């Protein structure tokens, strides 16, 4: 999980923690669908 610090300045975007959690959830679902 490469982490670009520039993605943490909150203007025009959500707190980076929550987008990270969202994308992780997406990854879990996609892997599960393939199994």
């Amino acid at each position: 999980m490469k982490r670009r610090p520039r993605k943490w300045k909150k203007k025009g975007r959500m707190r980076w923690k929550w987008i990270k959690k969202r994308i992780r959830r997406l990854k879990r679902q996609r892997k599960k669908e393939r199994g």
Partner: protein
């Protein structure tokens, strides 16, 4: 590998009250655990529908503080009766729901918990499941594990056994150490799949007696009759080439007709549901245990 449990050897005898009307704490605990696992299990009509079991997690799902061995034993039973597909990665457990599950649950969700468990076990026995093999072994007149050990060899001999090979092989694997547990030690320290099969049936028509490492089991012929005709009502299940001997058959004969096990609408509904979907559940059982 070994597929063994400790400590809970006496835990599974508490289903003896299922055929009665008395309800103890253990029985209601089991009734609470079973539906919990069933709902937890996924179902969608292989590697895409398997949930891992983490004991520290499935202990607060219902505020229980239950030891792991009990949890292992209960799903062992659920598989042994063909209600739950279990895959054991080394020191890990993975759970999937079957076709019969989410059909018995689908139609009989509103029955009493005790009768829900009872009908679940009955439906399991009704179809070609490992439990039905043990039931037919009893009907042929087995007393202990050794007769089952002979009957499995007999069944794999005929080469129609391909549908249920791996289940029998797992039983044989377990027996290869349950026999050791009872051969020399009076303490039945561990539980094999055979004992889990004996219990559950004890919750229907059998009676078990722990005896110096052994599991001496006897039938109660009234209920055995009360379910024999039910089995013959829908003959969508093979005897696996076994045959009832005399004494069991005649003891079935010449009896006072005990009460039908449940309400009559329950019996006919259970008949119809499995009749109109027998093929799919049989194929699922082939996936469970069948090879080709």
């Amino acid at each position: 590998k070994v597929v063994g449990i400790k400590g809970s050897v006496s835990y599974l005898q508490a289903l003896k009250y299922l055929k009665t009307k008395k309800v103890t704490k253990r029985l209601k605990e089991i009734e609470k655990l079973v539906d919990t696992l069933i709902t937890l299990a996924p179902y969608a009509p292989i590697r895409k529908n398997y949930a891992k079991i983490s004991f520290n997690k499935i202990k607060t799902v219902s505020r229980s503080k239950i030891g792991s061995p009990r949890i292992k034993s209960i799903m062992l039973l659920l598989w042994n009766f063909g209600l739950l597909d279990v895959k054991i990665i080394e020191n890990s457990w993975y759970v999937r729901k079957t076709k019969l599950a989410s059909l018995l649950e689908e139609n009989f969700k509103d029955l009493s918990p005790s009768e829900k468990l009872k009908v679940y076990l009955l439906g399991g026995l009704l179809v070609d499941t490992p439990a039905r093999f043990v039931y037919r072994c009893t009907l042929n007149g087995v007393e202990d594990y050794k007769g089952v050990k002979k009957a499995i060899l007999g069944y794999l001999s005929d080469q129609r056994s391909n549908s249920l090979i791996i289940g029998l092989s797992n039983m044989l694997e377990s027996i290869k150490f349950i026999e050791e547990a009872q051969a020399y030690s009076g303490k039945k320290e561990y539980i094999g799949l055979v004992d889990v099969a004996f219990y559950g049936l004890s919750g229907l028509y059998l009676d078990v007696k722990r005896e110096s490492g052994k599991l001496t089991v006897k039938p109660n012929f009234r209920e055995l009759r009360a379910l024999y005709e039910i089995d013959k009502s829908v003959a969508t299940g093979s005897d696996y080439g076994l045959s009832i001997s005399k004494e069991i058959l005649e003891n079935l004969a010449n009896t006072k007709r005990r009460k039908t096990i449940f309400s009559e609408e329950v019996q006919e509904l259970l008949v119809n549901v499995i009749k109109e979907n027998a093929i799919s559940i049989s194929q699922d059982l082939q996936n469970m245990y069948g090879i080709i």
